[PDB]
Symmetry: C2
Subunit: 177 residues, 2 copies
């Protein structure tokens, strides 16, 4: 059974590493963002990526890979902080729609800029090839049970100083003293 033991060990270690990595990346992302948590940020972004009419708890839950119950708690938190407004859905009386407010959008402009520095730092050791490989393997793991990911104008909004700072942080161009 040595082949089986070695496969199991490798699976255990890959799982444990996924879990502790996401813990670390969550904590680190919260420090970068500063004014939102990573979970708040990703929930607002998920809402911005849906059509207003389709911003239901179920659709938001599917986009985030999580349960309706978790999105319900997150959305109530966003509403009490004044980041979203929650109205009844016009298609279904049991469902909701979520609109991002002016405050929400303001905080997202600030967090997106910081987000660009965070991506630069997190992936500075990766080639483009290795990122594509990582992304591909994470998508394969997603569909282990038969159900596939629902992933994520926008280009024109990124200003040239952000991309300049991104290039410098990613490439470690600076000759350190």
């Amino acid at each position: 059974y040595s082949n089986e033991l070695k496969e199991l060990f490798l699976m255990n270690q890959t799982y444990a590493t996924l879990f502790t990595l996401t813990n670390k990346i969550q904590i680190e992302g919260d420090k970068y963002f500063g004014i939102l948590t990573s979970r708040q940020y990703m929930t607002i972004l998920s809402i911005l990526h849906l059509p207003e009419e389709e911003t239901t708890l179920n659709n938001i839950a599917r986009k985030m890979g999580t349960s309706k119950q978790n999105i319900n708690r997150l959305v109530a938190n966003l509403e009490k902080n004044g980041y979203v407004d929650v109205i009844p859905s016009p298609h279904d009386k049991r469902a909701i729609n979520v609109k991002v407010t002016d405050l929400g959008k303001k905080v997202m402009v600030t967090c997106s800029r910081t987000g660009i520095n965070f991506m630069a730092d997190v992936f500075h050791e990766f080639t483009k090839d290795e990122l594509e490989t990582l992304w591909s393997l994470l998508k394969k793991m997603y569909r282990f049970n038969g159900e596939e990911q629902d992933g994520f104008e926008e280009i024109d909004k990124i200003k040239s100083e952000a991309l300049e700072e991104f290039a410098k942080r990613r490439n470690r161009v600076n000759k350190n003293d």
Copy 2:
């Protein structure tokens, strides 16, 4: 002009997005498999069992889990209320604690570990050993982006009785998808 930078940023955004939503799904799915613990509870108890008894401080457990002291304090308080751990003073520092897994905590972990093996088979059934080595390696690389490397569970490597042999047989059959038969 910044087309290359935009491309790289987009790809990093998608990888991060996919990582986040994947671990959300794996957590919910792991909760369903284990049944009598959540995944977080399970991994916290396992982190405690990989540390020496005297070095089961909040800080050391946090470091093993890749999270904060405050998050471990809440997890450990939830485990204590459930009867899975006892919390006692650290003998080496008056401020610090130690955490001991109770007999009820050990029994629940034996049940969850067995289920754990079937979960691993299912989650990774499409992966070759080589893909797993590649994924693991790339996850370790991302971990150390800030200069701090992972403090992992790799000391698991360094007696197969009948019960273990049956668990390993079920593992191989699940992994190789001998059902979808009819």
